[PDB]
Amino acid sequence: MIQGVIQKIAGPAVIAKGMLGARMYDICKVGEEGLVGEIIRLDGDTAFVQVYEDTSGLKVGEPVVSTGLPLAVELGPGMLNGIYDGIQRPLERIREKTGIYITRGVVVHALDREKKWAWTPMVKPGDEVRGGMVLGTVPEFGFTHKILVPPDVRGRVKEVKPAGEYTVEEPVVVLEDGTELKMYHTWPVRRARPVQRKLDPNTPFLTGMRILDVLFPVAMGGTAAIPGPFGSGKTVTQQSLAKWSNADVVVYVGCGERGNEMTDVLVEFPELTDPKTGGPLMHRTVLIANTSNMPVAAREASIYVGVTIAEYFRDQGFSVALMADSTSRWAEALREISSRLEEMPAEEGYPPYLAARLAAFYERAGKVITLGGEEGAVTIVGAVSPPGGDMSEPVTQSTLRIVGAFWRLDASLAFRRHFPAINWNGSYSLFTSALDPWYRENVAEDYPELRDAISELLQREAGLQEIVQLVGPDALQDAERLVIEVGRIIREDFLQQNAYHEVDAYCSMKKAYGIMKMILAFYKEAEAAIKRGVSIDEILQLPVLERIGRARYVSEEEFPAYFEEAMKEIQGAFKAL
Amino acid sequence: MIQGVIQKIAGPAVIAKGMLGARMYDICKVGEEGLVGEIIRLDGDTAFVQVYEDTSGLKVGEPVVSTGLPLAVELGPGMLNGIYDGIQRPLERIREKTGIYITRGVVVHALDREKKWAWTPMVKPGDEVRGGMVLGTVPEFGFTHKILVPPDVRGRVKEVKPAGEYTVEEPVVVLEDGTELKMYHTWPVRRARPVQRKLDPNTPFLTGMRILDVLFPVAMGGTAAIPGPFGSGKTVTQQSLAKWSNADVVVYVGCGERGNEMTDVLVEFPELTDPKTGGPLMHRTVLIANTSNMPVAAREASIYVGVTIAEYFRDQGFSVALMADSTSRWAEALREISSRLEEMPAEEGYPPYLAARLAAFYERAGKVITLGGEEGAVTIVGAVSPPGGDMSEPVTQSTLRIVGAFWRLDASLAFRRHFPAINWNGSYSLFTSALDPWYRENVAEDYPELRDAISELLQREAGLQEIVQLVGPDALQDAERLVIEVGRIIREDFLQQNAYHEVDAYCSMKKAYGIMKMILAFYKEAEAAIKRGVSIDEILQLPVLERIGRARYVSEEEFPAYFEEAMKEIQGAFKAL
Amino acid sequence: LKKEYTGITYISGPLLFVENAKDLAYGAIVDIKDGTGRVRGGQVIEVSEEYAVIQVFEETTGLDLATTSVSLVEDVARLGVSKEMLGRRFNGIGKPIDGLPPITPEKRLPITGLPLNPVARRKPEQFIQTGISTIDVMNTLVRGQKLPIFSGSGLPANEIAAQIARQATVRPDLSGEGEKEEPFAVVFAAMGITQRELSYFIQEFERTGALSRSVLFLNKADDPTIERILTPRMALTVAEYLAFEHDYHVLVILTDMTNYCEALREIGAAREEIPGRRGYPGYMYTDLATIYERAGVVEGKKGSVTQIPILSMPDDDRTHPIPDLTGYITEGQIQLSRELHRKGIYPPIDPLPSLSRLMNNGVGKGKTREDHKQVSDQLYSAYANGVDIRKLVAIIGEDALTENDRRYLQFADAFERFFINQGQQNRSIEESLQIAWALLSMLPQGELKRISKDHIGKYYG
Amino acid sequence: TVAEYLAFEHDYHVLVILTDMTNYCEALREIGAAREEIPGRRGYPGYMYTDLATIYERAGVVEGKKGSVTQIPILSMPDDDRTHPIPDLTGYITEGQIQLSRELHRKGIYPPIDPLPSLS
Amino acid sequence: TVAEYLAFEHDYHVLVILTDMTNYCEALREIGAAREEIPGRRGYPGYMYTDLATIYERAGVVEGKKGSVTQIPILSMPDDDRTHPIPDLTGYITEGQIQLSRELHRKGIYPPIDPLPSLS
Amino acid sequence: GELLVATARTQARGEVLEEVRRRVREALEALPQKPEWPEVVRKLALEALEALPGAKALVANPE
Amino acid sequence: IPGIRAQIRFIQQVLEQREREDTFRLKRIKGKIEAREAEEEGGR
Numbered sequence A, B: 001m002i003q004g005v006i007q008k009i010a011g012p013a014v015i016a017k018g019m020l021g022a023r024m025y026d027i028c029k030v031g032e033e034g035l036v037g038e039i040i041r042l043d044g045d046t047a048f049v050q051v052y053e054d055t056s057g058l059k060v061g062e063p064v065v066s067t068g069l070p071l072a073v074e075l076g077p078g079m080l081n082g083i084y085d086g087i088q089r090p091l092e093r094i095r096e097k098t099g100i101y102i103t104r105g106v107v108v109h110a111l112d113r114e115k116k117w118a119w120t121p122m123v124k125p126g127d128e129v130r131g132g133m134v135l136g137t138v139p140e141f142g143f144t145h146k147i148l149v150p151p152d153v154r155g156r157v158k159e160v161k162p163a164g165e166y167t168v169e170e171p172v173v174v175l176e177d178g179t180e181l182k183m184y185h186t187w188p189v190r191r192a193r194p195v196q197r198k199l200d201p202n203t204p205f206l207t208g209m210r211i212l213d214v215l216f217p218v219a220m221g222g223t224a225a226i227p228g229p230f231g232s233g234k235t236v237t238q239q240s241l242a243k244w245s246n247a248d249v250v251v252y253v254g255c256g257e258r259g260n261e262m263t264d265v266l267v268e269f270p271e272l273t274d275p276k277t278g279g280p281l282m283h284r285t286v287l288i289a290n291t292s293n294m295p296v297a298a299r300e301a302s303i304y305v306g307v308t309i310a311e312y313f314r315d316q317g318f319s320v321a322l323m324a325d326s327t328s329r330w331a332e333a334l335r336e337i338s339s340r341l342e343e344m345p346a347e348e349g350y351p352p353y354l355a356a357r358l359a360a361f362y363e364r365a366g367k368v369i370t371l372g373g374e375e376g377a378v379t380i381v382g383a384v385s386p387p388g389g390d391m392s393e394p395v396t397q398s399t400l401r402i403v404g405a406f407w408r409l410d411a412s413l414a415f416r417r418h419f420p421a422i423n424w425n426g427s428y429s430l431f432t433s434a435l436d437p438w439y440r441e442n443v444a445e446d447y448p449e450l451r452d453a454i455s456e457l458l459q460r461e462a463g464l465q466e467i468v469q470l471v472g473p474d475a476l477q478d479a480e481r482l483v484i485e486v487g488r489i490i491r492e493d494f495l496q497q498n499a500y501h502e503v504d505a506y507c508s509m510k511k512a513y514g515i516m517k518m519i520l521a522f523y524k525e526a527e528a529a530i531k532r533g534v535s536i537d538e539i540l541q542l543p544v545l546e547r548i549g550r551a552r553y554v555s556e557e558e559f560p561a562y563f564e565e566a567m568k569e570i571q572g573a574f575k576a577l
Numbered sequence C: 001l002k003k004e005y006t007g008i009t010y011i012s013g014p015l016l017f018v019e020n021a022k023d024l025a026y027g028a029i030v031d032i033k034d035g036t037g038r039v040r041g042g043q044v045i046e047v048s049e050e051y052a053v054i055q056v057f058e059e060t061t062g063l064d065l066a067t068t069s070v071s072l073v074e075d076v077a078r079l080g081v082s083k084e085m086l087g088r089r090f091n092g093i094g095k096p097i098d099g100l101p102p103i104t105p106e107k108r109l110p111i112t113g114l115p116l117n118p119v120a121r122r123k124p125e126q127f128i129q130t131g132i133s134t135i136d137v138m139n140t141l142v143r144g145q146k147l148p149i150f151s152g153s154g155l156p157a158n159e160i161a162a163q164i165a166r167q168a169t170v171r172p173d174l175s176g177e178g179e180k181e182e183p184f185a186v187v188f189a190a191m192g193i194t195q196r197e198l199s200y201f202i203q204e205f206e207r208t209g210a211l212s213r214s215v216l217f218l219n220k221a222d223d224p225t226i227e228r229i230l231t232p233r234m235a236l237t238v239a240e241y242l243a244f245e246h247d248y249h250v251l252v253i254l255t256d257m258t259n260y261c262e263a264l265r266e267i268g269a270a271r272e273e274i275p276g277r278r279g280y281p282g283y284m285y286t287d288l289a290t291i292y293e294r295a296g297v298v299e300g301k302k303g304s305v306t307q308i309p310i311l312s313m314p315d316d317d318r319t320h321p322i323p324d325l326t327g328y329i330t331e332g333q334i335q336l337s338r339e340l341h342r343k344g345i346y347p348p349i350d351p352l353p354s355l356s357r358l359m360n361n362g363v364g365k366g367k368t369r370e371d372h373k374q375v376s377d378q379l380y381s382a383y384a385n386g387v388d389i390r391k392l393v394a395i396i397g398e399d400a401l402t403e404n405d406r407r408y409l410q411f412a413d414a415f416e417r418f419f420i421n422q423g424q425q426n427r428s429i430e431e432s433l434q435i436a437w438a439l440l441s442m443l444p445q446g447e448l449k450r451i452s453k454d455h456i457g458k459y460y461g
Numbered sequence D, E: 001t002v003a004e005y006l007a008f009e010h011d012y013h014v015l016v017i018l019t020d021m022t023n024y025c026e027a028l029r030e031i032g033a034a035r036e037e038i039p040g041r042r043g044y045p046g047y048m049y050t051d052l053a054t055i056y057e058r059a060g061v062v063e064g065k066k067g068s069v070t071q072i073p074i075l076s077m078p079d080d081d082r083t084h085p086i087p088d089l090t091g092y093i094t095e096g097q098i099q100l101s102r103e104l105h106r107k108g109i110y111p112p113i114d115p116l117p118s119l120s
Numbered sequence F: 001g002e003l004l005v006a007t008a009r010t011q012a013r014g015e016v017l018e019e020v021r022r023r024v025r026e027a028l029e030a031l032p033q034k035p036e037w038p039e040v041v042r043k044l045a046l047e048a049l050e051a052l053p054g055a056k057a058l059v060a061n062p063e
Numbered sequence G: 001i002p003g004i005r006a007q008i009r010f011i012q013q014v015l016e017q018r019e020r021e022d023t024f025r026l027k028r029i030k031g032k033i034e035a036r037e038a039e040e041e042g043g044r
């Protein structure tokens, strides 16, 4: 299309002359090996082509061939049960071509061109189509994978392929303006997929953890951010969300973390079972992995490919989760490509437009009515890892102004193994005032007042922690020692949850309502007994708070009979005093 | 002899032009006077000289003449009993030549070129010489200064000039190559002198101070670092290391420290006497002084000249001790030339190669076999000056990864005039386990176990001191008061030197072992007296505690009978209780 | 042939600028020779159509501009590797310093490695016991793991690394296979050690006899401060070769990575480059990542790489960028404590700031014992109770505490004297779990809430 | 300018509620670093005080007319400290403050205004 | 210069009182921040040690002459600590210190000196 | 002892490779007395001119 | 109270020092940008 030669090489930087008329953010091919570069900062007749592999062995004067089209994913049937990298190339075909290392510049296609799919059509000839109307249907891993008209593409249908078995290259619809419509379509990643309307959130993203569903909920069309220092437990939390949530598809985006944690996800998932379907669990997850040493300027593309795949599965009526980990590695990738632009940096070396990039990424969520007539959602869980363990960073202070449901993981609750290590003194969730009618219909009737009782009692506990760190555990009254001990058994029997035990990994909220009603009945009858007046040491040695402490290791299956027995013993253990 | 002119003057940095072919790190005579500079940052045909003297009053046009040699010291007979500055010029000859003010631009030779030295050859015609072998001795004061082959010279001896008395410039050996070996020889100061093999250090550097060889010893081939803020002494500790040691020669290099210390060392050392051979003490000191108001780039070369002269006396078999005072002033000298040279800094102005420079300095210490077969060692005690307290400085933590022994002074422990101010809660030494067979042969049999009991008692005292400060003096039952009082006797009787008393300054290992055995026998027999019902306040005014307390003043000759008499007093003073 | 280039424009620090060099490839090795015939390594880190920047791998003393031809060698930087280097010693450039002949290179690999494919990895899964009781019980070292030893400035990190070198073994009878005992092959990558630590490592490896299985890339402290960049890459090249083409079980000891990060700070400050935190550059995460993530096991092959980096934490924290980013790339750390070494405990491993993210893959039922994870969790909770009750003792004093509060205080120091403290003894995993139950028997039931009822019924006492 | 127009040419009383003054200051820092000018204190631009007083001090009644612009700026404090430059300079231009409290909210009170740090 | 003249030409016994070093170091920080050099531990320049030492090492006595230039600098701790650059880069040069205290001044004792943190 | 036998083996193996290098060094030193010597020298000069596009000077010996 | 005041003053001094280092690096890189636009104006 447009030709040039390499002028200068520096790491992830190829400044290239001879290119006048090239456009910004359009994908070039660098060198004779055909590396995949993207243009930033074109001037004169040059272009600062950054590259998505390692330039190590490139000489100057090698040709640079532009294309004039931006970074296009290929969106169609076949992305499920798949591992991709930051330019959407399937890593399994790269494994089959190369050895066990990933050599630069090998080209493969993001969808199989030789697997035959089952096309069942749902449009008659002479029918009108707009961008977003469904055309046919392909069954895929038990899902009913629709096939969309590409947006901005309009017209009248001339002819349709019959019900059969065809490949993703076969033109399944031929319109009246000569335009064929295939099973897939290319799409630039830096554009939000156009949509009909954004709704308001009234349904929770059920994590399966007790604290992050009771105290800090996330609505289905909402963002969420979970920071913490290294050793807190971000990644095991996000794999638990990928393993036990009520989402149709889960786009797990490894944006600059280790590869061992991704081999773990590829191995321990196909044994497991999707709860909403009956099938396996790797049959619903799309997995975009750009590891630590896989090259640095591909992380921006790897964080956009995941979100446009999640928007594609939003446009089919599904209900998508996205888990993007270590977005400060994406900010550091922007800093490292900024380091050779020699453009003037903001606080701590980051480029100035970082907050605008984070905003225009996190605003691609949110429970829409699509152009096809159905509703969908993308909910984003972003892990923001600060460098010094300090949340005054320019990345974290630009994340926590646009996310709802911000979740600080501390390290002092993580030294003692208290998982998940959600700090309660500084984490917040704003969706508690639009999930009230959903709770009051689908969990219980007194569930917001019971959640507020828990939060008010934990606030009194963390108020009295001043006095217990200053004066001592004694020189305190019996009622406030009751408050401290009940807060401690809340944090040990309702908040703490280990994600490796067979029981107590997935905890649906009937069990969480049960545990909170146990603890609040214990607290109310204990404070009534302690204002009647008994000793506290003959309260705190009952065989019923051991029942509460083991009430989270019992199964979901027989749970309400156990809850009835716990309530009967919780009146019959203060009957005796 | 590449000759050019000045193009630019900027501080003490002369950017000369017309030099195309001058080698990097040569020494070029800058100015019409004959000033001395070192050349870095070649550019086109434009050098970057730094001068070593002051630079005011120069112009643009004056010739700079490149000698084509690196910074070379001269090594040979006539360096002991001598003072130099940072480029090895004798200060007595300058004081004789120009006045009582160190003027700019005067060239006196390092070794005096007219003293008649006796020569006694140890080679004959038809022998072969390698690098580092002996060619014969010269008697200097009461030493036996054997002269070396230069370490890059070998061949076959063609003639030897006979026995008599000569001058250091006169060529005494002629090889069968046309080359002639003189008495002195030049050596490039930054290239480290070679060795055959480095051994492990297993013999202690006896320093005459009780704590610095009993609790934190340093071997003959090891390194030690002394921090300390102002008013923490450190100068009397360096001078006590210089006065009272077992090392045969001492190179005292002071880079950026006040002149009153140097005139103290120069005036009073011809009156003292080393306890190994008699005569003066000043006949084993090479002192390289560079006062604060002397120029700020010569501080860099003062350290390398000191350590190259120390390796020169190490190659002759002598065990050398190098006291390098104020290496942080050398760090500020590198900061000054770096910020003159317009580099980007790291961690408060210091250049990023700082710890590599400090490793290159502290690596030259060791215990080697020389090239001439015999065995030698050199040990470096480096006084670091942090700004105030503040052991998190770049130079302190950059020298902390290298040094084998760390001797931390305090201000609060020195504002109570407890000299030396060695904080034993933070100081350490890695040479304790390696110096154990030398101890078990040459001081006692149970000597490591005894000072491990001392260290246990001091850690116990310092741990219990906190609750003593909290609750007051009362609540300690019986024997913890004894732990306080024995710890007070230790830190007022064993750890507290004077260094100005005529017999308390030097303390050999036998007297320190004796005082240690006194204190532990007092403690064991007092605990045996307190396990039977004797009041703790009764024990603390027995007279034998005074016989322990004044036992740092009994002399080396008068000690052992006094030790045995204090042992029988320790026995016969608790029989009445 | 052998092309040359004269015309060096500018030499300063570690850098020199050749010009009219369009044929120097990026990342290529050059050799520089002056009038005295001595050659010096170097590598290109920028190529233009005008000129080309070169970093110098040795000391830059003696160069000039009327001479010093710069010639090209090895288009991309490569190490020639054979199998015959299992007893040798090498410097930072990769040349033998033992008086022995140079090797016969079978293959020649690129030094920087290629990133390992996440589809073709395997889970690091097989239990290594190391003898150290804290690492065996509480922070498990599993074969195929990266875990650095975060140490202080005077702490004995080198002795703990040498102890894990001399006694780490896998026990297959617990695992269920037997199948052989082929021992480890050590690759010892030393960056700027000071002949004291070097003499300790060499004397330890020669008394145990491991030098007939171990290659040593020694880069001593006086050697120039740029080839510390090259040292871990040309050590993990040999590690990847000997693990993934000849099926050994290579254990790499990456000594003192703070010198590597110092060398990167030097070469990043000489390039006028965007700092990160405390002056270290932007790409330090990527370079520590492409050292560390060249380890693990692969799928369908036999080998294993186990990395133990050693860290000198500058002001003994987890906030400096070197131990911080090291802990971000790696999977778990083992952190040493200044308090326990002042108390005289070896190995002074405090288990609270240390962890191992691959513990759950390689412990438990049929792989160690049925109680391993639960014993670990109860030790963590009870020793945390001891740690934060010592602060309460420091606040109010002991004689306002009751008895169960004092049992935790007895558990904490009995723990520190008996479980942690062991002088050079090889306590295996069964005896260490026995001592763990002997310390848990200082606490009554009802206060052991993380151990199942049949375990606490049959192991207690 | 719409509020000041309405109050000073149609004599209304106008209440102007400015939501999230932290996002304004972060965008101001962003545009400073885009326009290539040096960050002053704490990374914020040096001219932040006058460029913030320009959008505070356009309030105020005026003698001789009948309009009145009242102004409520609302700002998220970054880490609940009033030593940060954004609430520092806002409290150093404005007339007192009211302060929403963390405790009264998450033990359940709406609106959570405690009157101990507030001031008019 | 006047003191060196008197004591090394006419054999006087000059005592030189330099009454404020905080103003001298502030003045050095003012005019020294014009050559565009990176500053030091507080904002004071890198060369401040050499600059203070070239006006402190000009004290001292010379053999062969009966003269003497003894010096008393007087410097205020800007806040009451010894870890500020002016007191510690005076204390690294000079021959001791004599330190005024505030405990001995609120109790009405002139000259307020505690002799514990002071030595020669 | 096993390091002794292995290092003796590898140095004995190395010096024979050194003497093979000696033989080829001398057999390439004694190449300029051969009838295909201008052929091989002009072939190498053609390659040296080929790898450097458009040379100016060509340095050769008086022989 | 004064121990925590000493810690807070130490932390504010060292954080202000880090801020001063970074706003020196920003002035140096602005000098590099203006030198890159101005030195290659004449020679081009």
Ligand SMILES: Nc1ncnc2c1ncn2[C@@H]1O[C@H](COP(=O)(O)OP(=O)(O)O)[C@@H](O)[C@H]1O
Binding pocket: A228, A229, A230, A231, A232, A233, A234, A235, A236, A237, A240, A419, A420, A497, A498, A499, A500, C355, C356, C357, C358, C359, C360
């Ligand atoms: N929810 C959880 N339940 C049980 N264990 C957890 C949980 N979260 C973290 N952990 C433990 O903490 C360790 C650290 O987890 P990880 O997420 O890898 O750290 P990071 O947050 O730095 O990525 C893991 O090895 C895991 O065993």
Ligand SMILES: Nc1ncnc2c1ncn2[C@@H]1O[C@H](COP(=O)(O)OP(=O)(O)O)[C@@H](O)[C@H]1O
Binding pocket: A008, A009, A010, A013, A014, A015, A339, A340, A341, A342, C015, C046, C053, C270, C271, C272, C273
């Ligand atoms: N003195 C120097 N020596 C070597 N490299 C430098 C020097 N000064 C700046 N650089 C580097 O040269 C690069 C030039 O930037 P630019 O021309 O935009 O990119 P590129 O050279 O990759 O096309 C900068 O990224 C900078 O890091």
Ligand SMILES: [Mg+2]
Binding pocket: A234, A235, A257
């Ligand atoms: Mg992680």
